[PDB]
Amino acid sequence: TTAAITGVTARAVITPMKRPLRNAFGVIDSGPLVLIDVTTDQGVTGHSYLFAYTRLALKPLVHLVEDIGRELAGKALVPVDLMKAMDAKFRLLGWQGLVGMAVSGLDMAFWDALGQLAGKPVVELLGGSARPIPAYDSYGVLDARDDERTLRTACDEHGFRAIKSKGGHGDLATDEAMIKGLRALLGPDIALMLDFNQSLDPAEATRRIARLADYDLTWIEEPVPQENLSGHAAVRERSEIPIQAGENWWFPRGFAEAIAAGASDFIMPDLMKVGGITGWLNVAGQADAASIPMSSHILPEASAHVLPVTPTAHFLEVLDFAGAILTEPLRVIDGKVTAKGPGLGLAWNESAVAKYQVT
Template sequence: MRITALRATPVAVPYRTDEVWAFGRRAGLVSVLLEMETDEGVTGLGEAAAYPSADVVLSVLRGLEPLVVGADPLRVEALIQRIDVVGTWHHVGHSSPAIAAVETACWDILGKVSGQPLVNLFGGRFRDRVEYFHYVAAASPEGVRDEGRRAAEAGARVCYLKIGADELATDIDRVAALREGAGPEMGVRVDPNEAWSPGAALRALRALREYDLELVEQPVSGRNLPEMAYVRGRSDVPLLANEASWTRADQLAVLQHGAADAISVDHQMDGGLLNMKRSAGMCAAAGLPVVKHSLGELGVALAAGLHVIAATPNFRCANQAYGALLTDDVVIGAFGGPAANYRDGCLEVPDGPGLGVTLDADKVARYAELYRSGAAEYTFHDPEALRTAPALPKR
């Protein structure tokens, strides 16, 4: 079997409410869908988050074509080594989501050819359902309180809230409102996205301690691991590394510095599903749980990560997905993005061969046109944030 073509389609899917973080907002997400064609008529699916933009992803995919077209998609390790070593793409970063999409498509083909769901190829089911948190968009305290109630009524066990506002009082009000709305049993995870200096982080953690936070994600710069370790050593609120832990090399450094209580991993940020499985194994050896991170993904990439999580023991915490925000998805059937497809915050592992998902051609066409006509609305290039000239850290 040989790869004959890569077909990439950027799509934009709206949110039901804006995603807001410490430095901007977006009204939906952009992903690049990949269809890998072969000379035997088997097509593999992949997906790349538009990080840092769809144009970059599409450019990387064009650059990968000479290395990929003509290769055997069943020899996944050999193909990725060709990309990394011969093509010199091993310095993962902005190129990583596109490489991950290629690798995912190969795994989808391998699963289809062997008649096995991907979870079986990554070690078999350790769990039948995978838990995800309920994404609560930053809003007024009243809006956050209402979303917390919505999450509890849907059966979610963990809520995730973006914080890192200009004033600590704003963050405190939002977290208090979430706790009130979601109830005392709900896990509450917050993410300042590196908005704080170490001193500001400790002050914030002390102020938020009464709300029984499950995890605080990346409170300080991910590029200063001694300061992360400093904060961790002076607070009993568990820290989750994210911007500090996008690749296996980054994760090793976090472990060496003792800078986090849990590690965020993401196949799109580190070149593929095999590397995410390796990340989890490395963290397991250090005695730490891992959490699946998402840059914003639709049903194809969601399914890919789901299979690996289901086969890997130390994904013990609720993982990141966008079902609570998305209005729609691009895959056929109940599996995919909208929150209605989750049961008690969990998704069932697909049991079809490969990824177990199929693209909905009509929806792909609809959201490809939406990308062509209005992609700017679905990026983080928030005009208000641009006018305020934000900088890291905020305080």
């Protein structure tokens, strides 16, 4: 018969980062994470993690995961049914925001558990195969001089053929100087993406984008606030560079309304906000219908399991917040990433967890 959930625990950690990532709104210089364990009555504990953005989110997210989780004891391990139940539970309060991250975190852990119980990676459960997905190396604001060694190692050693950096921290001249430097340093055969992290308004985005058009950029990411779907659509209409967005939209319905608005050319759901594996698969069918190339936002380990069954799969984003607390950290080979199992391939390095844990 089917495994049942027996308990749920969540722990907060703050991991270190070598590359401090400056963005238009400030700097992320550590990895605040929430580590989720779903125990079963069949000798398996499912695992997933959330990137929490800021230390302030950790305590609330832990309360949520554990309080939602407690009510799941005794329930059959059936992700689709569990997702429907969480939907009903939070219908009135709202599942956008921290609640939805807890819900998506739990979903990933349920699927990880199912994978473990079967001795297979999640990607095989989903009817696909674990194969190399094109990846890009995701940075904060870069400087072609100061960061040359790092970028050399990325492209030469790890084989990356795509790099993303950040802009909107200053004026247009600052963005242009950065991109011009990068394009000169990396040459014409490396893809370059630019992420504004929601920092512009539509008129200013249109203006900057037109002035960056000569650097052969692959996409412009979140040019304006994520909630501003109409403003994204306006920028998209006038842009000669594809518009990428989605990492901050909530659940399959959030994607359905963005697509209805025509907000972007590309999407990149975040597994923590799209409703975990279950919600991702829904959106994959939406993106196929809309002919929208679909990439992932961080959570590279889990994202590697869903991109191979995504009809319009595009890029996997490499930004490694969790490696320090994982038994088997992400590996990039020849600029690509392959899913690792069983489950999602998330098992904790407990000595490191103990070191970086916070309460």
